[PDB]
């Protein structure tokens, strides 16, 4: 018989009815490593923990590119005006901006 959380009653033959509720045990391990803390929230709510971890995963790879896309935009606005006219690339900036006009460019 599936005893989910709110319990069942069941009557066998002519005995009085018996009610049995479900405890809130699990299989994982709380208060430990970040990889074994997901298994603790996996026996508890096994289908509502994938939609939670994906929005905590999509918020990481999106916010990581949007800092580098602002890096490459801000890198461009310091290398371009020293690349139109014939002139040196000022190696003071080479230590900061690892400029693609390195050696013969």
């Amino acid at each position: 018989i599936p005893v989910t959380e709110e319990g069942i009653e069941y009557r066998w033959g002519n005995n009085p009815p018996v009610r049995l509720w479900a405890q809130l045990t699990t299989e994982g391990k709380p208060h430990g490593w970040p990889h074994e803390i997901i298994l603790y929230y996996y026996g508890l709510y096994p289908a509502a923990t994938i939609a939670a971890v994906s929005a905590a995963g999509l918020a990481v790879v999106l916010s990581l590119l949007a800092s580098c896309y602002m890096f490459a935009t801000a890198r461009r606005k310091c290398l371009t005006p020293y690349a139109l006219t014939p002139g040196a690339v000022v190696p003071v900036t080479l230590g900061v901006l690892c400029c693609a006009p390195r050696a013969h460019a």
Binding site: V3, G7, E9, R19, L20, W21, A22, Q23, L24, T25, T26, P30, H31, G32, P34, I37, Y40, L44, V60, S63, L64, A66, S67, C68, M70, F71, T73, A74, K77, C78, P81
Partner: protein, 438 residues
């Protein structure tokens, strides 16, 4: 004094209400509901028993003919037959060979023992909920009953409580009730004047002892075969004894919210749904003044076990600094954990324990002893069981709010990744003004 609270509708579960006013000591309460039985406003529409086909001895007149009388009974069926020859036990019967009629009649009425066992068809359109509440404070310990609507008022010690209207309006009775002995069948029985032979309600009388019986059981006669003094009749059998054995289960055995269903003033007791608003009218002769209450300072809380078990898994060693022996009234203020015994005593050295029951990995609640507050913290562990006979004693709140292990790794990632997205926005202001001005 006036105070409002909303107890849950769980049978056999204590609730703590806490009263704080000016000048007096903080005082807790403990309301507990014992039984809850709602009944609809019934009205009997008909009564069904077995039937009893009465038929008298047949009449044979052999000198001449006869005619039917055509009286009025429920299923009064006369039919006269032509020339017969009865063949009684000694020789012939009526000393001729033809020209002899035979008047045969039969009809139906209500059973003999109908007032003892009988089905009844009521109607459920409203409801009327009653309850039974144990009220506890100080040295007052009583138990009363009151209608759960905003018009009834009970007095217990010197106060005047009033229980508000129910949140929901849910009844497991659909509209209609069929009671036989100890059981309600959630049916859609045919109305008075639409009986069907074999299905339920072929005998419908308006009440138990009245007249005007209604019956259509298709009582059709036939002629006797050749030479026997009998009377044949064919009709569909008793519908009421179909229903005693064809009944699967009552509404008792499939009611939604754990309800059980009794029968004599037809009702459905101990149903756990919704919540009850209350209204309190405790006078000022029950409180204690802050002069006589022991002033308690320098609170501290620490735990040792915190099991997720349903009863009271978790101990809490709690210290303080008092001056006078007296009496306090503990309480929490958050629905993450619940506190037992509500009124624990005091001692000069601060060493008293508590039994909480939380249901999350890291609870964070707050305790007031005698207007003297603190917070608590725990590192709870799961229990090694699966099926428990008793029921829960905690409000469900699974959220490790702002300090646990499951929160610290979230704050380091989102406080470490977010610090490098806005840092590129700083570089987007740092460089672009220098280029543009140059």
């Amino acid at each position: 004094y006036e105070h409002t609270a909303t107890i849950p509708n769980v049978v056999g579960f204590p609730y703590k209400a806490h009263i704080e006013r000016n000048g007096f000591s903080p005082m807790t309460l403990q309301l507990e509901v014992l039984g809850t039985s709602l009944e609809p406003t019934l009205n009997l529409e008909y009564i069904t028993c077995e039937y009893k086909t009465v038929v008298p001895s047949p009449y044979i007149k052999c000198c001449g003919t006869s005619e039917c009388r055509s009286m009025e009974r429920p299923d009064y069926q006369c039919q006269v037959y032509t020339g017969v020859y009865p063949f009684m036990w000694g020789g012939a019967y009526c000393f001729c060979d033809t020209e002899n009629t035979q008047l045969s009649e039969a009809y139906v009425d209500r059973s003999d023992v109908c007032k003892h066992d009988h089905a009844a068809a009521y109607k459920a359109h409203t409801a009327a909920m009653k309850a039974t509440i144990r009220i506890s404070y100080g040295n007052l310990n009583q138990t009363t009953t009151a209608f759960v609507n905003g018009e009834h008022t009970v007095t217990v010690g010197g106060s005047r409580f009033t229980f508000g209207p129910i949140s929901t309006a849910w009844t497991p009775f659909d509209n209609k009730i069929v009671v036989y002995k100890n059981d309600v069948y959630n049916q859609d029985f045919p109305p008075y004047g639409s009986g069907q032979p074999g299905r339920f309600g072929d005998i419908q009388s308006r009440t138990v002892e009245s007249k005007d019986l209604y019956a259509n059981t298709a009582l059709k006669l036939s002629r006797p075969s050749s030479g026997t003094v009998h009377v044949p009749y064919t009709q569909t059998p008793s519908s009421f004894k179909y229903w005693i054995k064809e009944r699967g289960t009552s509404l008792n055995d499939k009611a939604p919210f754990g309800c059980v269903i009794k029968t004599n003033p037809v009702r459905a007791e101990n149903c756990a749904v919704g919540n009850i608003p209350v209204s309190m009218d405790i006078p000022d002769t029950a409180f204690t003044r802050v002069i006589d209450a022991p002033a308690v300072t320098n609170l501290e809380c620490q735990v040792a076990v915190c099991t997720h078990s349903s009863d009271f898994g978790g101990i809490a060693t709690l210290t303080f600094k008092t001056d006078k022996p007296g009496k306090c009234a503990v309480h929490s203020h958050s629905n993450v954990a619940t506190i037992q015994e509500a009124a624990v005593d005091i001692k000069t050295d601060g060493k008293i324990t508590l039994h909480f029951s939380t249901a999350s990995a890291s609870p964070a609640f707050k305790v007031s002893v005698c207007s003297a507050k603190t917070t608590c913290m725990a590192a709870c562990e799961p229990p090694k069981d699966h099926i428990v006979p008793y029921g829960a004693s905690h409000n469900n709140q699974v959220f490790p709010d702002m300090s646990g292990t499951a929160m610290t790794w979230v704050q380091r990632v989102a406080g470490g990744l977010g610090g490098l997205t806005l840092a590129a926005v700083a570089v987007l202001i740092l460089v672009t003004c220098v280029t543009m001005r140059r």
